[PDB]
Design a protein around this ligand. Structure first.
Ligand SMILES: COc1cc(C(=O)O)cc(OC)c1OC
Length: 182
């Protein structure tokens, strides 16, 4: 409907797949080569379904900060026959607050879904499902089951992936450029 939705749609159309684990179907952001991200609570194993294709997992790393606190991001390398467009130049370098973000989701349950979530706070610490978590972004939208892994963007930046909510607020894990230096 506007330039925010334009950027979000460009990311969804080329850099997302539908990931299925034993814990559910998730929006999965492809970042470069065969490397993607997903919430850690997806519990990625040795095998994952990618757009309903059985796919070997070459590597999976559940990220933690240097205080050894959960970040809720798993980086997955997929045994896929095709690379993602490299979008690392759209990742922020530092923790920040943002204006006018979009949360985009693509699954069987929620195809081509885009939500204007407005202002995004650098919230920091969250007890996420009982797990102390750092680098959380917060937005005031009543996000639901089915939106986990959803991409959070502004115009020109891919800033986070949706990991939870409390009925009134939604919470995303930050994506930082430094996670994807190879
Ligand atoms: C349609 O929105 C954009 C898409 C892309 C892209 O390369 O996908 C790059 C942009 O910045 C130059 C955009 O504007 C912020």
């Amino acid at each position: 409907m506007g330039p925010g939705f334009d950027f979000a749609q460009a990311i969804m159309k080329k850099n997302t797949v539908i990931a299925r684990t034993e814990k559910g179907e998730f929006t999965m952001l492809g970042v470069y080569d065969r490397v993607a991200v997903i919430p850690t609570h997806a519990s990625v194993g040795e095998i994952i379904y990618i757009n309903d294709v059985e796919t070997r997992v070459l590597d999976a790393c559940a990220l933690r900060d240097l205080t050894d606190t959960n970040l809720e991001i798993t980086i997955v390398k997929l045994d896929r026959n095709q690379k993602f467009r490299d979008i690392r130049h759209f990742l922020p370098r530092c923790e920040d607050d943002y204006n006018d973000a979009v949360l985009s989701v693509h699954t069987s349950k929620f195809p081509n879904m885009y939500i204007p979530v407005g202002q995004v706070t650098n919230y920091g610490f969250l007890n996420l499902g009982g797990t102390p978590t750092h680098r959380i972004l917060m937005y005031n939208f009543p996000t639901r089951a089915g939106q986990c892994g959803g991409v959070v963007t502004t115009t020109g930046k891919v800033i986070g992936i949706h990991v939870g909510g409390n009925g009134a607020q939604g919470f995303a894990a930050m994506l930082l450029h430094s996670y994807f230096t190879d």
